[model samples]
Target: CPSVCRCDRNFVYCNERSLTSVPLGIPEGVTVLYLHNNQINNAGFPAELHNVQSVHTVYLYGNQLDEFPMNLPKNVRVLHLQENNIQTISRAALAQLLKLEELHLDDNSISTVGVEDGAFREAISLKLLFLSKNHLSSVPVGLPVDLQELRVDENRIAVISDMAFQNLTSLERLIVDGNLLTNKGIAEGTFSHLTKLKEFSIVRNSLSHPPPDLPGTHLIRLYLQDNQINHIPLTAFANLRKLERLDISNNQLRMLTQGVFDHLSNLKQLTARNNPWFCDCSIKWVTEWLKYIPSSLNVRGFMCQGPEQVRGMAVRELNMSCP
Candidate 1:
């Protein structure tokens, strides 16, 4: 007999039990099932649970799931499978869950996703996917068409192919922070198709320069902090006419080219701190432009990180007086 199995109305709570596999006497009216912190593996997924078509939320995280589980009901909307040992996820395994919207597969050992045969093709309603803290080397392709938010931070993904996100036109917020991306991988028009993208984050990468092309318009916030960028291309940001906030701190920049801010008419806040900027003729234009802009623009942390003598002086406070 099961040691600890309690069911009340449409809710079931199973915890701290010696049962090896799924229990047998659960009613079909149960909607909320909590079976967390267990040793259940792929074989523990109950085959008889397919009859319970009313289950909308399934919390099966903190288990030993290696690959995708099978025989999940089609009515499941929220599947919490984080902190597992899942290595590979195949398309066939995810075909049964048609109404799945939120999937938590973070903190796993996954290397490549959607590589075999579009693993997420069947999940039409999938909107939020969290795949952080994994070993992904490349961006997953053929994601759900209705996907709205994708968080893939703390991964080893180095190459983000322009075509990797071609189908996700409805995406609004994309977070790819804490990766191994280099300047060569972020091509000129990598974000050309994301017309609806409002917020983008490529922070904490190995980028040595700004991306060649930004979106023409409709971007609100851009975070490019903690990179190796040394130079800012004059026309690099010409396309971002609607950009409001930009954070490019902790870089190796030496100067800001005059034409860098030519087309940024609507830009409100700009951060250029913790860089090795030179206080020379190359940076003279930056000082002049700041005088005409609104006081809200912050360059207070902008200091000379070169030429030893002027290292600590703010760029705006430099004497700039000719001898």
Candidate 2:
């Protein structure tokens, strides 16, 4: 057994030990390695670390690694390298990890040019890739087809080409919140192949209108809050019959027409706060719709910020009729 690492069955727990390098001579049969929250750097990491064939799941996050580690164990499955200073992900670093499943590299300094083209082509089994809080300006291509969850929040991403997610048919959760996405950046059929998608979030972007063509029927949770959307098209949510949670808070919306939510019978929650809602006869249906929502459902943010008479008043209390 290594000197400082604790050996427990097939796991080696050496996390938070202030170690600057990998401890050699790990005992046989240790498959899971935990060395997170340390000060390990590229110089301290041995190139022959891949000789440890038994280790599969490696946790080296919260370290000082400035680049993606090369010569990694070919059999590694889940790799956690988030919270590091990694700037580049070279093809050589990932060309041999054939069994890689989940790669988490969030909170790094990765940029568009840092990730070489087809950098992830060799990791054929990758399922979840987390690149949030990085400097990515566009969605990387050549992602594995089996990926189920992809989170790229808080990046400088502004455009999503049509072919970005064309083959990601198995995606179940796609979160691109806190980016510079607008209506023009997203192509027409960008999400057509995500048939299995259930949770799609695009909060805190620069959208001025609800995306026209989201995956229909199968979506369960849709989050579009904190954007600049001013209107909800009648066809915006016409197909989300299975939707249970819808959030449109803190936008510039002024009205939500009658049939906008008629198909969403499975709605369990609706958040519409902090918007400049016109509390006139146009929004009367909102109050009426709330009347029949089941007790199990939770709705929030119905305050009116328009028509001086109804300013700061709840939408339910507004008593107005069209002439």
Q: Pick the candidate with the highest TM-score.
A: 1
Residue pairs in collision within model 2: none
Per-prediction TM-score: 0.92, 0.90
Off by over 4 Å in 2: 1-10, 13-24, 43-47, 292-297
Per-residue lDDT of model 2, residues 1-323, tens digit only: 67877878788888989988877756546688898999988767565667667878999989989888876777889999999999988887787787898999989999989988878766779898999899999888767788899999999999988878868888899999999999998888788778999998999899998887888647999999999999888988887788888999999998887889887888899899898988888887888777766787888899888888788988766566573
Residue 19 of candidate 2: its Cα lDDT? 87
Error of 2 at 77 (Å): 2.0
- Candidate 1, residues 1-323: lDDT per residue as tens digits? 13477766777776555345566666767787776677777787677776678888887777777887887766889988888788888787778888899998988888885245578767889998888888999887767888888899999988887767777778888889899998787655777778777888888889888776666557888888988888878777888888888888988887887788788777778888788887877777776776667876554458888778778887776666443
State which candidate has the highest lDDT.
Answer: 2
- Residue 159 miss distance in model 1 (angstroms): 1.0
